Ligand binder design. Structure first.
Ligand code: GTP
Length: 457
């Protein structure tokens, strides 16, 4: 990803200077070091230029036409997807807006994007989940069209003290409501297929249920495990990776809808009173960002494997990925340090899994996926617990954007926490009930959460 242009947009995007994250009632109870991310360049916590930091993710492009490894990697991934029988047909407008089998309704809580945010117009002024009306969206598609700019927001989230000082805040590139809906029309059936088929054919975990799907993961990835980290994955994508993705879509039957992939690769963005064009890089908050980044990751690993290892047999290779996060398997040991050496040739920055200093071996006890660990059950060791560290749950419970939502928040964290055991769950359930706001909530018991968990298999 490279910013090839920066011009005067003609409009102004005014984002708020103050974060919505306020310390919660549990700010003192539990310990934590994360603070709200830097949103403006005048934040006293800064220790370097804000706009230099947030845009430095664009490290440049490796301009190249698809090499032979990419072509073979593309074919193999197409071969894995062939039995899924993906329909390139478009889904009706009502389903793209309000949902169908395997596709949740479009999220109404986020920005409608350009130009609606400049008109005091929100998604609920066009969308109406109760009536499921489409006439307003049809008129809006007719009036403002497609291939509209993205709106760059600083992501208002918790970050480490280190990333607060270095200004490493993340960005949301919010698609126009027109382009999200139109893209969901073009690729909706593919989204549904992926969401309903997490595994090693899709190589995807998007739309999965960790409670259910964690047990299938070690069965699918039944060989020598390896994993690694990406630094700035989305923005590091060169256009050639978008070309591979296009060739995958073409082999599945897509024709005119590959234009949406061009729309993500060569993208227009609005930030403040600026209008900048990025050559390459995946936008953060486009519809289908997760899946297309997941499909591109399938192409990347395969490409690197063929390039590094001489007589690799991709039909013995298996992987599951969610955006940049990937867990992979091969019968013989694969060293990610050698793969990273090849990924730098393509502009990819691959580093040891989970911020480690060294490249050490990956096993079913240290490996994580979607921040969660793998721990088998004691009574049913064939059932694998997805274990979110209590650390992440403490960092999260300590802040809130809406103290009215404390109940939903805490119980959401209870669905994640009880996988750490009876000891951790009740310690965390006891510390919550240690303040007046706590015991007023409804906290499920360890035995009850377990009851529904095992009833699902
Ligand atoms: N910018 C952005 N990235 C997102 C978002 N959601 C998921 N991501 C992914 O998360 C990655 C950003 O992770 P960071 O917190 O910046 O960490 P990092 O890029 O791996 O950098 P290091 O942690 O130092 O290695 C991006 O590469 C995206 O692929 C989002 O809303 N905005």
């Amino acid at each position: 990803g490279e910013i090839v242009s920066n011009e005067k947009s003609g409009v102004c995007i005014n984002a708020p200077a103050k974060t919505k994250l306020q310390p919660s009632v549990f700010h003192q109870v539990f310990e934590g070091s994360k603070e709200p991310a830097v949103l403006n360049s005048k934040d006293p916590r800064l220790k370097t230029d804000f706009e230099e930091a947030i845009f430095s993710k664009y490290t440049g492009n490796k301009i190249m036409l698809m090499d032979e490894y990419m072509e073979e990697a593309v074919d193999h991934y197409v071969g894995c997807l062939e039995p899924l029988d993906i329909s390139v047909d478009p889904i009706p407008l009502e389903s793209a807006m309000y949902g169908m089998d395997g596709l949740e309704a479009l999220d109404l809580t986020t920005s409608a994007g350009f130009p609606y945010l400049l008109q005091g117009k929100k998604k609920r002024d066009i969308f109406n989940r109760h009536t499921r009306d489409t006439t307003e969206m049809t008129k809006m598609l007719e009036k403002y069209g497609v291939d509209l700019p993205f709106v760059t927001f600083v992501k208002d989230e918790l970050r480490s003290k280190e990333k607060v000082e270095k200004g490493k805040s993340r960005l949301i590139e919010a698609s126009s409501l027109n382009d999200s809906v139109a893209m969901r029309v073009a690729f909706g059936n593919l989204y549904a297929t992926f969401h309903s088929n997490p595994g090693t054919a899709t190589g995807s975990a998007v739309g999965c249920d960790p409670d259910i799907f964690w047990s299938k993961i070690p069965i699918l990835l039944d060989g020598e495990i390896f994993a690694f980290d990406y630094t700035g994955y989305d923005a590091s994508l060169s256009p050639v990776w978008f070309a591979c993705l296009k060739k995958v879509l073409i082999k599945l039957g897509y024709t005119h809808q590959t234009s949406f992939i061009d729309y993500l690769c060569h993208s227009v963005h609005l930030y403040k009173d600026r209008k900048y064009i990025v050559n390459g890089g995946m936008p953060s908050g486009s519809s289908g960002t997760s899946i297309f980044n997941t499909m591109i990751n399938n192409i990347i690993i395969r490409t690197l494997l063929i390039r590094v290892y001489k007589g690799i047999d991709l039909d013995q290779f298996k992987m599951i990925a969610y955006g940049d996060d990937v867990i992979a398997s091969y019968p013989h040991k694969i060293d990610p340090a050698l793969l990273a050496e090849a990924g730098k040739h393509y502009g990819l920055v691959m580093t040891p899994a989970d911020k480690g200093t060294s490249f050490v071996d990956t096993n079913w006890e240290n490996v994580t996926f979607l921040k969660r660990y793998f721990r088998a059950d004691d009574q049913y060791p064939f059932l694998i617990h997805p274990v979110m560290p209590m650390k992440e749950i403490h960092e999260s419970i300590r802040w809130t954007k809406d103290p009215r939502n404390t109940q939903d928040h805490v119980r959401s964290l209870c669905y994640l926490a009880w996988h750490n055991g009876e000891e951790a769950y009740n310690e965390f359930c006891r510390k919550i009930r240690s303040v007046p706001v706590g015991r007023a909530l409804t906290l499920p018991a360890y035995s009850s959460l377990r009851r529904k968990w095992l009833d699902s298999f």
